[PDB]
Amino acid sequence: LVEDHLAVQSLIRAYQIRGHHVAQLDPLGILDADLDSSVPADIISSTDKLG
Amino acid sequence: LVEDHLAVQSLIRAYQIRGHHVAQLDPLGILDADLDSSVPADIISSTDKLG
Ligand SMILES: [Ca+2]
């Protein structure tokens, strides 16, 4: 825990600076609104990315 | 030092995200090209802002 809290700091960055890239804004379900379907590695969508 | 390193993290943010607001780009000396004469609280120009 000597510098693990640091990651959590950076964690919040991601959402406040990138969460809108993975939001569910399309009503149809297909045709993503940001024109890119990739999930940035910063946003934790699966537990593996904790690594 | 339990979470003081955190500040240093945020410290680097400032420069990489705001240092250009306090750079010496004007050649004359008067006239700030960024139309801003204010100095961001993020950047440390004087030791007091360490607080
Ligand atoms: Ca300025």
Q: Tell me whether A4 touches chain B (CB under 8 Å).
A: no
The token pair that represents B11 in the structure block? 């410290």
- Resolution in Å, one decimal place: 2.9
Give CA–CA dist B5/B3, Å, rounded. Answer: 5
In B1-51, DSSP assigns E strands to none
Task: Answer whether B6 sits within 8 Å of A5, measured CB to CB.
Answer: yes
Residue for token pair 């510098």: A3
The token pair that represents B28 in the structure block? 């004359």
Using CA atoms of B39, B45, B46, B48 in order, give the dihedral in degrees to the nearest 10: 60
CA distance B49 to chain A (A): 21
CA distance B6 to chain A (A): 6
